[PDB]
Amino acid sequence: ELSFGARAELPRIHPVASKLLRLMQKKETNLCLSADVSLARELLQLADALGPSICMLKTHVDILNDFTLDVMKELITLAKCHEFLIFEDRKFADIGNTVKKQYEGGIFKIASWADLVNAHVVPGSGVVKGLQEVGLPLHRGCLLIAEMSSTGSLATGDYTRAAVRMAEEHSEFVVGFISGSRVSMKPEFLHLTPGVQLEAGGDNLGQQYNSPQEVIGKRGSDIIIVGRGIISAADRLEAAEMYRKAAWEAYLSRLG
Amino acid sequence: ELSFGARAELPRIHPVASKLLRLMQKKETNLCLSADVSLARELLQLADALGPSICMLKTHVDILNDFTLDVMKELITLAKCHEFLIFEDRKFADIGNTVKKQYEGGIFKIASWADLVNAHVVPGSGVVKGLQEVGLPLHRGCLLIAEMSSTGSLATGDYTRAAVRMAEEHSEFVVGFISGSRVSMKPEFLHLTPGVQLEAGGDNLGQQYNSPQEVIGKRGSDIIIVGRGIISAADRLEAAEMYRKAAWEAYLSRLG
Numbered sequence A, B: 001e002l003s004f005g006a007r008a009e010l011p012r013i014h015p016v017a018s019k020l021l022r023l024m025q026k027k028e029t030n031l032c033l034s035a036d037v038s039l040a041r042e043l044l045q046l047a048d049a050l051g052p053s054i055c056m057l058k059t060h061v062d063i064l065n066d067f068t069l070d071v072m073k074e075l076i077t078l079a080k081c082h083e084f085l086i087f088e089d090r091k092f093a094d095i096g097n098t099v100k101k102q103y104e105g106g107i108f109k110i111a112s113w114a115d116l117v118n119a120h121v122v123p124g125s126g127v128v129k130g131l132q133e134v135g136l137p138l139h140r141g142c143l144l145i146a147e148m149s150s151t152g153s154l155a156t157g158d159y160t161r162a163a164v165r166m167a168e169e170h171s172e173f174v175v176g177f178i179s180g181s182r183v184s185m186k187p188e189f190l191h192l193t194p195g196v197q198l199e200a201g202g203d204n205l206g207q208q209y210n211s212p213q214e215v216i217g218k219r220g221s222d223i224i225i226v227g228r229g230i231i232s233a234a235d236r237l238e239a240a241e242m243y244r245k246a247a248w249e250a251y252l253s254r255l256g
């Protein structure tokens, strides 16, 4: 198993994955903040304060009440300052012809500011083809959703294998997966795992939690995605540091 | 097999389905326009001119370059005038806690103006639970994506059966499906079928077309969803009338 720094140099590494892996090793962070807030001011204050602790800030631009492209300009300034990637968790899941417009256009212009986006594989590989026609020219990357954290997920067995094949056949654009575990044996591919909290439990709408030690250490994933475990805490900086130290030590102990 | 007018009166019918089925029978239309345009002025001019020919106008609010909630106010005025439902084809596909915010909030406030939305079933039933916590109080309905028109679709076999079970277990909110065919044997549930053109063919990004006669007449669906077959035509009114007459006659001939 290679360190994040060595994976950043693999011959077939995507430039976006390389940039991410480099700053993960430099900053000793494999934490992605899920900035699940409705106010631009809270999004930007979290990005600034937690920026040093995170490798990535995950957005849902479509729950932000006061979205403007200028908010995203301010977010990019913080991402550059503190060295993290921006991941818009849009979960593209339509035919190729539709997702290309949803990615490039409309009010959000996601491709203009998001380093990473993700897509469901259920529509077939046209979803990736459509996104890549916008994303390749704009030097972006994509994650495929191979497994989900929610109760009753149908992303199991042959579905997960199809996601891995689709990623591996589109390595020019696909840099990894949303998954609960290592699903690809190819080290050029990032594994990002949501459904993470230090304590056992869930929410009232099908979310299920596992710990950083379980998903990084035992299940072999690279990055934890954490929302409420940080966002709902009083001191979001100390919460982020707890999650960072947990995920980083779990990674180190798997390396040996 | 019951007429649309008789299905509108079924004991377990959802109010949104009833309203739709009534206006389908009144207007002799089972055509849903896929208004896949980037300009509000074009969206509204299509809605006004084609309103009499359609039972439903399907939107992708996130490809509209000049979206404002006022554009949707003008769309509702036309929907009321001409008697059609508004369907936002958002394809919600996240955990329940996330989709409730994506449906109610952000810039689009989809639940405030959309009669219908749709969701993927891959995350499990929490996607429906989350949407229904916004949609039930706002008297809205939802369609579940049981089959897809695109090449390589994984929405087959056990996946399609899971979508039908999920719909049937959430009949308070779920009024039907996006599908290629009749997938539910319960007549209270609408079947809407995209991937429709009069001529054989496809697009360059995995879209596959079947005719109105095939999907309404042979495959037993209720409503055709048509984008480019109308939108790319010079005379979009005559194109809409051709699709309406095709879908309506296919429906009548299945009734006998």
Ligand SMILES: O=C(O)c1cc(=O)[nH]c(=O)n1[C@@H]1O[C@H](COP(=O)(O)O)[C@@H](O)[C@H]1O
Pocket (backbone or CB within 6 Å): A034, A036, A058, A060, A089, A118, A147, A148, A149, A150, A178, A194, A195, A196, A207, A225, A226, A227, A228, A229, B094, B095, B098
């Ligand atoms: O793509 C994702 O990040 C995602 C996939 C998944 O399987 N589960 C999952 O929870 N998510 C997202 O990750 C975040 C989880 O947030 P918390 O449950 O608050 O930690 C939410 O923004 C979800 O939309």
Ligand SMILES: O=C(O)c1cc(=O)[nH]c(=O)n1[C@@H]1O[C@H](COP(=O)(O)O)[C@@H](O)[C@H]1O
Pocket (backbone or CB within 6 Å): A094, A095, A098, B034, B036, B058, B060, B089, B118, B147, B148, B149, B150, B178, B194, B195, B196, B207, B225, B226, B227, B228, B229
């Ligand atoms: O939910 C949908 O309407 C949808 C599902 C699907 O399986 N296939 C499909 O094409 N669609 C949508 O229906 C429309 C098809 O448009 P045309 O191919 O131009 O007729 C697009 O807006 C797609 O996003």
